[PDB]
Design a protein around this ligand. Structure first.
Ligand code: NA
Lengths: 427, 427
């Protein structure tokens, strides 16, 4: 028994945000019917393919546990089909532009008329009511709109995008929270709701720690845990000093700790010829004696220039630089093992190659080999929530229109009618 | 009616990941009782305070819509009190070290006996059964473990952390999905489950697109949309040109498009003195004619060297450099409007200062002013999901043990018993 067994999802989504939401629902047991445009379908199918005329890894890794039906929703027969499907549905998920679904003939009011129990879930770029609510947002545009780009990277370089899908998949996971919340009250009210997530808002949620920083900066004029708080440390491209004297918006802090304890990205053996030969090393305020033992600096234990966070503000980047010299002949795994002996939070920069072939992630079901006889097997990320009572069973992504007839038969249509729909090119 | 009205949460969490989960449940109506250590409580209270002896902004921005009780769980009386609270709870939430809750007297097995309906939810560093299951993980350590640092930043720079809480808040939002899914299944089964989210796995879920890229690279030996795919553009430390000939793990691509169309971060007027005077500019394949119009390059519309993705691969960075020269005397909002009249979605980098005081975000309830009559008002981020049926009502964060006696009275304790517990230093 899986959490969303019996939950029927009408899935209009494409690209990444929406599809990530409905795929993860499918991993938890939902019956996901992906409605695709006749003859082309989700643009990810043909987006950066690795084999010619085979659905891409972009498509397969975001569309497992779904069935595909092709539908021309601009036809009268298509609209009648939708109406029938909505009456069988628990959740409708879409990421069209503002007002698109209303123009297709299906307002929220009309949807409620068709099915009082159906939840309507949307991914948007900007929140409804925002000055910016209508225009488009790709992955990195949301990262920029939500404060992530401005606070990511280095003080002497540009705003920097995250490799993680802070815009797309993050918004999809946020929409999943919204949909599940709507399911929970429906047990009381018996009624579906409209739920929407703007990509800017999903990013801003994760950037909450930097809105803390903005207020601290306004109130106090300094962020003591940032590199720029160290006198004479940070400079711009042209050699101008960067101190909090002149800083009015949360700056980029390089590899500083964020919402963690102070930390830094330190080089390990092989860093010149291996881009990922680094650890993240933390200096937790309650672990200074342990650190002093590790690096053989007993004289730093009782010295007030070193043994409080306040004392270290003027030299912390010097301390990271010295710690780094201890790792010069050790790889990242052996530095991680060394720090762990002291209980010091520290871990490796894992490469994508290391992650793809890691035995442990395959053991726990986080990296999963999907069985696909048509395209060949591939890896995907599984469910990142682990449950005592069940396990996902991940199955291959559908071919375009693979399940059209199967789905129409479930709506009780006879063979003659299915033949008519094909002949009319409705399906 | 709010989704989680009547859901009683026994909240052991501290720092960021756990508290972000329980706060957002509170925003959706949950009754959150935060169990804190007598005398000190959640470390965020005293972490980077902006005023002496006043709860920090880290604390207040992650602990609205909660009540605080102080409890010594090392005492037999405290353990008995916990047993009573567990019997009235729907969800227990924790982010202690591995085994820590077992050691304080409450194994999953014991918990099930006390209350067959209760859900136990945990934030972990690595998943149960992982080779690294006993490693301590916070924020940037998790960004490193889950593939984000390896794939964020520049090819000639270090692995780079996101300013967004990819580790902590992201893991908390993933746990909330798990909890809501456990509630769904409990409606059918009548039984609670154990759910857990590892920070590595929450990060890797958002890094799915780079696991796409790792398989593409292994299968084909190139990622055509990356800057390194342009011959003689990207160089290493020593001045040698990088190419995918010798790249076997997904590299850092600077400000390339990720899951979006090809893009780059482009300077606008004032970039030397304003760190956030930038726009993200996307070159979507079927927008090339509009882009040619915008930048007055009519020759490029019909030239096969320029008018397809494939043709642009050997010079895309040159094209970006050229487009950037057109923005040198325009600010990021002027550039965005100029692109928008050609139908081109361009995105400004929003500073934290701009976001904190943006009218629109306060209009839609995404940035919210909390009325805090104890500490003075502050801003926070609200619910990033917007519902037709209700609005969150955000109330200020609790003082340490502010609600101890209130909570004990709800358990059925009389004033004499409560007085005894205070005297014995159990609360
Ligand atoms: Na030593």
């Amino acid at each position: 028994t899986k959490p969303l067994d019996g939950i029927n999802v009408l899935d209009f989504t494409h690209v990444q945000a929406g599809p990530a939401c409905t795929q993860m629902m499918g991993f938890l047991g939902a019956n996901v019917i992906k409605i695709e445009r006749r003859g082309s379908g989700d643009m990810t199918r043909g987006f950066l393919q690795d084999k010619p005329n085979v659905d891409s890894l972009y498509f397969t890794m975001f569309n497992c546990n779904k069935r595909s039906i092709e539908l021309d929703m601009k036809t009268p027969e298509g609209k009648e089909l939708l109406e029938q499907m909505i009456k069988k549905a628990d959740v409708m998920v879409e990421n069209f532009g503002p007002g698109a679904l209303d123009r297709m003939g299906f307002t929220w009011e009309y949807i409620q008329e068709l099915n009082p129990r159906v939840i309507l879930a949307s991914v948007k770029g900007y929140a409804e009511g925002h000055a910016n609510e209508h225009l488009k947002v790709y992955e990195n545009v949301a990262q920029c709109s939500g404060g992530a780009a401005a606070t990511t990277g280095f003080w002497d370089g540009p705003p920097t995008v995250s490799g993680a899908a802070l815009g797309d998949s993050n918004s999809g996971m946020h929409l999943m929270i919204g949909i599940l919340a709507a399911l929970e009250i429906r047990h009381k009210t018996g009624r579906g709701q409209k739920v929407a997530v703007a990509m800017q808002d999903a990013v801003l949620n994760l950037v909450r720690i930097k809105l803390r920083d903005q207020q601290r900066l306004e109130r106090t004029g300094i962020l003591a845990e940032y590199p720029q708080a160290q006198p004479n440390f940070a400079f711009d491209r042209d050699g101008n000093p960067l101190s909090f004297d002149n800083i009015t918006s949360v700056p980029r802090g390089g590899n500083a700790g964020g919402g963690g304890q102070p930390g830094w990205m330190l080089k390990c053996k092989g860093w010149e010829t291996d881009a990922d030969s680094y650890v993240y090393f933390t200096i937790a305020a309650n672990m200074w004696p342990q650190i002093c033992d590790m690096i053989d600096k007993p004289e730093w234990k009782d010295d007030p220039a070193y043994n409080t966070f306040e004392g270290r503000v003027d030299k912390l980047m010097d301390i990271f630089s010295f710690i780094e010299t201890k790792f010069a002949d050790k790889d990242k795994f052996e530095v991680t093992e060394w720090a762990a002996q002291y209980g010091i939070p520290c871990g490796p920069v894992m490469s994508m190659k290391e992650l793809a072939h890691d035995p442990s992630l395959q053991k726990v079901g986080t990296v999963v080999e999907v069985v696909d006889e048509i395209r060949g097997n591939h890896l995907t990320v599984g469910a990142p929530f682990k449950f005592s009572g069940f396990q996902p069973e991940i199955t291959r992504a559908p071919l375009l229109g693979e399940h059209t007839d199967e789905v129409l038969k479930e709506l009780g249509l006879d063979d003659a009618k299915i033949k008519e729909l094909h002949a009319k090119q409705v399906v």
